[PDB]
Every structure is written in C-alpha cells, then in structure tokens.
C-alpha cells in the first residue's frame, strides 16, 4: 500500500524559515515524481513544486509565487521528499500536502505564518437550560475561546459519547484568535443523573482541558 506522511509544519513568523518532510513507502521511490500542493480557505488548492524521479535527474519546477524562496529536494535512499521554505509570508499559510504526482496524497501538515503568539484556549460551559422541556430534549456544550494557531479537537466523555454531538468549525475573531463550540443534545431526564465532560486538545500550545458541564445551580 502506498503511504505518505508529511511533517514539519507549525507556527512561524513572517520572514522566517521552515522545512517540511514527507516520508514515503509502498512504491519504488526513486522512480516516482513527487509534488507539493498547498490548500487554504482563501485560495483553494495551489500547486507549489514538482521534483523529477531519478531518470529525470531530480529536475525541479516551482510556482512563480514561491520561486526563489522555496526549494524542493529529495533523498531517494531515505524515501523522503523535502520542501525548504525561506522568507515566509502570511499568504504562504495553508495545509501542505506531498503527493506522488497527484496519484496519492498524504494527510497534510499545517503551516501558519503569523506574527501572533501561541495561545491556549479557555473552555467555558454552555450549561443546559433550567427550562429544559420535561420529558424532552436538552442541549449543552462547551465554548473553546481564544486560541492560536489552529487546530483544536473536541470529544465528549473521552469518546464514549458521540450521538447528538455537533462540533462547529472554528471562527477567526477580530482579535486574531480563534473560537469554536461543541454541543450535544441529550434527554432532559439525564441531566440529573449523567455526567458530561468535553475533552479539548490544543496541541499547538500543549493544552488539554476536561470541562465538566452541568446545570447552573440557582
């Protein structure tokens, strides 16, 4: 089976440098052309660089946007392709994928080019309403506020609760920090008996939070 796995991304300041790496297996690497492609909500999918196989002398090709700043290279003995990015710009932000000339793709590595500092989130309860319809359905959740960079993941009850869960896409606030919410609907009857915990992970800040959400006392 063909496998590709990118690494090296993260937060970096404008003008800075970052090297991405892609580990490949499941095919004869030296015979494969390789590419880097990036994706952003802004610009969609953009081809970045291409590097030839050994028969084509590892010839390199670049998007004009990155020419002179980015360098694609490979180590056939290691089955690795690399992307060295210098003089990084805010608009270089995106998910970077390595691909076998567009046949197979890795999972991607997120590159955030920003002058802003890493910040872990605060987690606040979205407490079930005291007017939750008797015998009906209640909603509860957690608000994951003010983090940078992306991403954040959320689970409920350590993965034991998945039904009725909606975890919303993050929104970029005017402050430049992200926020997201996760909610779950449950039987009103269960609010007095069951415990609900949202598990929040912000790996960029090494921040994990387990927030128990319960009805507000009165």
């Amino acid at each position: 089976e063909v496998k590709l796995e990118e690494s090296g991304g993260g937060l970096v300041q404008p003008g800075g440098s970052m090297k991405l790496s892609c580990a490949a297996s499941g095919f004869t690497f030296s015979d494969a052309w390789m590419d880097w492609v990036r994706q952003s909500p802004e610009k969609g999918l953009e081809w970045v660089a291409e590097i030839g196989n050994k028969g084509n002398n590892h010839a390199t090709y670049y998007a004009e946007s990155v020419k002179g700043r980015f360098t694609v290279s490979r180590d056939d003995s290691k089955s690795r392709v690399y992307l060295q990015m210098n003089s990084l710009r805010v608009e270089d932000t995106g998910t970077y994928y390595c691909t076998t000339r567009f046949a197979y793709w890795g999972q991607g590595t997120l590159v955030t080019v920003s002058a802003a500092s890493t910040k872990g989130p605060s987690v606040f309860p979205l407490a079930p309403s005291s007017k939750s319809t008797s015998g009906g359905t209640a909603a509860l959740g957690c608000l994951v506020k003010d983090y940078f960079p992306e991403p954040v993941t959320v689970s409920w009850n350590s993965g034991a609760l998945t039904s009725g869960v909606h975890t919303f896409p993050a929104v970029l606030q005017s402050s430049g920090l992200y926020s997201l919410s996760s909610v779950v609907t449950v039987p009103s009857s269960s609010l007095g008996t069951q415990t609900y915990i949202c598990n929040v992970n912000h790996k960029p800040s090494n921040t994990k939070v387990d927030k128990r959400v319960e009805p507000k006392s009165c």
Binding site: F102, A139, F168, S179, S181
Partner: protein, 214 residues
C-alpha cells in the same frame, strides 16, 4: 497560466441519481486532467487521471470524459458517501492548476431547527467578556436567519456564525451564532434574545433569557 473553471459551484442530488459536473480549461490540455474528491478535514482522493482512467480502489460508478478544453465527471448513481467537494487539475503544463471545486450534497426532507440559547458563564465573566450563544440544531435546508436582540435593540456586526456539514451520521445542518459583548455592556441589559427564521418553521422562533434569572 491555464485557468480551470468548474460548474456548478455547488449542487444537491438524491440517493441513486446520476450526477454530472464539468471542468473547462482556458486552452487545450490534451486530456492531462485528473479529478479528485475531498471531504472536510481530509486530503484529496484521486478518482480519474488522464481524463478518463479510473484509479484502482475507486468505485466503477465514477467515470471521466471529454477532450480538448471540456471535461466532465459522472457519477452514474450517487451513493451517500459521495458527498464532498470535487476538484479537477491540469498537468499539461507548468504551473499545474486546479479548478475551484464543485460541492455535492445530498437531498432530503425539510427539517425545522430546534433552538437553544446559552447565557455567558460566570467563569467567563470573570475575565471581562461575555459570549452569548444561540444553537440551531438539525435543520434542512441550510438557509437560516438568526437575529440577536438585547433589550429589543437589534445587534448587528457583533456576532459570528459557524455551520456543520452533512456527514456519515447527519444529513441535516446545525449552526451556532455567538454574540460578543463586553462584561460592562452585558451587565447593563436584561433581555437577551435570539430569533430564528427557517422555512421549516411556520413563523420565527425566539429563545430568550433574562440576565440573572433562571
């Protein structure tokens, strides 16, 4: 650069229906065209290469056709798992260039949202900001209007919305709207209300709370 233009930008289809989407290049690309499917948060999956060659591991219901500047992807009979965004790519020349995507979603019955309002937590207020959240749960179609009022004053410009996608468990949408106020402003007002308009509702639904009551 060769411009790749996809049509439609987005569409809905019912389970089992035939789907055809198109990709037009600004010049002849000699069938050096690939198609991909992408689901949220996941990498692209190649479906078709060289305009009409199916990739190994892709269902036979997918096919590609076309020549010159004009190409098409057909799903002979849509399956639920075919929701996602579809892209084309030319590799006749450098730079390689991608289309802007076609979003494909599944048709289903109208569903009105259930609506919930959440006051800011006491924990958050300790820090000088108040977030008020309105949840619209499990509605279809996606069009919906959320109106915030604070003591009957319409709030404009101080809220942000986020919406879920259809997925393996849900063919409806859910939406959160978050109203941001300073603590000082929050504590000067009493009635917090979110009003929801959706075609599945006979009339708009309002959920509200009074600050400092249960």
């Amino acid at each position: 650069d060769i411009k790749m233009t996809q049509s439609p930008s987005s569409m809905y289809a019912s389970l089992g229906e035939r789907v055809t989407i198109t990709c037009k290049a600004s010049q002849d690309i000699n069938s050096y065209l690939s198609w991909f499917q992408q689901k949220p948060g996941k990498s692209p999956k190649t479906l078709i290469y060289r305009a009409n060659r199916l990739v190994d591991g892709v269902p036979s219901r997918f096919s590609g056709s076309g020549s010159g500047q004009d190409y098409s992807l057909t799903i002979s009979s849509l399956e639920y798992e075919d929701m996602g965004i579809y892209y084309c790519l030319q590799y006749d020349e450098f730079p390689r260039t991608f289309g802007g995507g076609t979003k494909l979603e599944i048709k289903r019955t109208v569903a009105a949202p259930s609506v919930f309002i959440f006051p800011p937590s006491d924990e958050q207020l300790k820090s000088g900001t108040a977030s008020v959240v309105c949840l619209l749960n499990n509605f279809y179609p996606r069009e919906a209007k959320v109106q915030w009022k604070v003591d009957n004053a319409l709030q404009s410009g101080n809220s942000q919305e986020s919406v879920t996608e259809q997925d393996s468990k849900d063919s409806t949408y859910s939406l959160s709207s978050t109203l941001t106020l300073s603590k000082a402003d929050y504590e000067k007002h009493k009635v917090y209300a979110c009003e929801v308009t959706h075609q599945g509702l006979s009339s708009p639904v309002t959920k509200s709370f009074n600050r400092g009551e249960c």
